[PDB]
Design a protein around this ligand. Structure first.
Ligand SMILES: O=C1N(c2cncc3ccccc23)CCC[C@]12CCOc1ccc(Cl)cc12
Ligand SMILES: O=C1N(c2cncc3ccccc23)CCC[C@]12CCOc1ccc(Cl)cc12
Ligand SMILES: [Cl-]
Ligand SMILES: [Cl-]
Lengths: 302, 297
């Protein structure tokens, strides 16, 4: 019993964190096999952050300009290439702590763990979700660039995010491990703004199922709804549309609790109209949207 | 920017998690040097039950390798299984007993394998509001200081309200609990006041100031109000501990106490603090400073 925001154990990722210094800029790198991955903005100077030409800046660099430190050992950079917004620094040593890994690009609503690092050293681990506006509400200070987002599947680390930027609203933007940004963001200091954020509906429903599995039933009602009527109500509360894929994904939780998806949707509609009335669901006075249907099943059943 | 419930990096502890099987019971053990620590309920008169066991009854598995048990002893509610091999991954560690209101990270394990890490606090009623299923016994709570892991908790049981109870690494239970199936209940819980104040400072540091007011209060008047809302008494030690946060934000502790008094008597009124409609009490003043300054391990 109990429902907590749970991160994946970070050990497999801690053994990959290195410090990358280029000139005055110091950030974190991900050392996998003989390659160190890091944000390409590590090459940027003061005069070139508004409109940097990364291809131009990188051609002027040599391998010895990149200082890579793994613990108290300096790694030797023997090559460098750029792949979208990520810099790939070929090094002379393969990381002995390299785990079984994959590079995966995630979709909004998906959750992951973040190992926040500064100077190549892990300082904390927390759970995040890719917001529908492609930002993440992280906990990042200056020096955390290159910190990674991941999930673990048996013994395989799926790297899904690398931190690059903080927007003016205090939210965060970054890329997958192939350097492709999530969202319409660019690694430039030009005026950028996070779009209006919306609640991840399928995740709120999964969390209501988690509450039912944990004994909470106060929010349940005798009503059902059509998928279209639910979406018409949901859109007015800035909730993401619920698709047939979402309904299908919620199937196992619906079978386990005996509450049809559209039946739980009618509970959510009521909660949106009424609020909680001094009550909590799983120790929260707000509807939690950073637990996916897959997280709920994993935490509740195994 | 940003404030998250953050756990310590779990790597140093992952390298210590092993599976302990005794008869039909399978749970987790902590392998430090040549000793595996686990809840004694893996084997009630525990001296009588243990005397009937031999070293070969305890099957200890570290990954896909079986360790050989060469001795066994009991220390309070923890079983210490002496093994032939010292854990090469043994980090710099201490066994520390924590106080209510202190926070720590839990590495939830099943079958000796880590499945998740989460941050939690030792409630004033000595329970933890964890997330544990059957098979998680022996999962540990810890803090990291520099390169030293301070082991502070080992999971033993779930109370009927879904909250959890356990021991320090010396086998002494937190709270008035016993490791036996009998009538046990978590006592009435209270809010960790110093932690709520630290979290209000974290909100100020992050730009959230709506709850601030011009008022101040005496420590005694604040304590009279706090007692009425099932909040722990705030001591001069707590006020002193909140000193650096008070200096950083320019808001005196008793000034922040007057904000908390108004939040208690009036509510949030549709507003939130750090994305929460409730007053969060599982961040200590040290956690807030650590997160709002980026201390690494
Ligand atoms: O966001 C950025 N940084 C930060 C990243 N994460 C958390 C931060 C918390 C406080 C201060 C800065 C933070 C550090 C690197 C540079 C920068 C500065 C702003 O201009 C840009 C524009 C684009 C890009 Cl890709 C990066 C940046
Ligand atoms: O609590 C217990 N278990 C559990 C521990 N943590 C999370 C659990 C989630 C669901 C089910 C059981 C859980 C494991 C088995 C032993 C047990 C069962 C109840 O009787 C007692 C009495 C005392 C002690 Cl020390 C342990 C137990
Ligand atoms: Cl995805
Ligand atoms: Cl302090």
């Amino acid at each position: 019993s109990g429902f907590r925001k749970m991160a994946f154990p970070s050990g497999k990722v801690e053994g990959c964190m290195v410090q990358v210094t280029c000139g005055t800029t110091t950030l974190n790198g991900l050392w996998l096999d003989d390659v160190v991955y890091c944000p390409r903005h590590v090459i940027c100077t003061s005069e070139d952050m508004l409109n940097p030409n990364y291809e131009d800046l990188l051609i002027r660099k040599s391998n010895h300009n990149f200082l890579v430190q793994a613990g108290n050992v300096q790694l030797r950079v023997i090559g460098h290439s750029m792949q979208n917004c990520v810099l790939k620094l070929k090094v002379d040593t393969a990381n002995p702590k390299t785990p079984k890994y994959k590079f995966v690009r995630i979709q909004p609503g998906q959750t992951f763990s973040v190992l926040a690092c500064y100077n190549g050293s892990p300082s904390g681990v927390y759970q995040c979700a890719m917001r529908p506006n492609f930002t993440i509400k992280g906990s990042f200070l200056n020096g955390s660039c290159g910190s990674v987002g991941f999930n673990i599947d048996y013994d395989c680390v799926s790297f899904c995010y690398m931190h690059h930027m903080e927007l003016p609203t205090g939210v965060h933007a970054g890329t997958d491990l192939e350097g492709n940004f999530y969202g319409p963001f660019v690694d430039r200091q030009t005026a950028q703004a996070a779009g209006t954020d919306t609640t991840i509906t399928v995740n709120v429903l999964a969390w209501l199922y988690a509450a039912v599995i944990n004994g909470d039933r106060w929010f349940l009602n005798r009503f059902t709804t059509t998928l279209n009527d639910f979406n018409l109500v949901a859109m007015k509360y800035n909730y993401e549309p619920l698709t047939q894929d979402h309904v299908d994904i919620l199937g196992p939780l619906s079978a386990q609790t005996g509450i049809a998806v559209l039946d739980m949707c009618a509970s959510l509609k009521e909660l949106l109209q009424n609020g909680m009335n001094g009550r909590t669901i799983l120790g929260s006075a707000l509807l939690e949207d950073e637990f996916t249907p897959f997280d709920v099943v994993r935490q509740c059943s195994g």
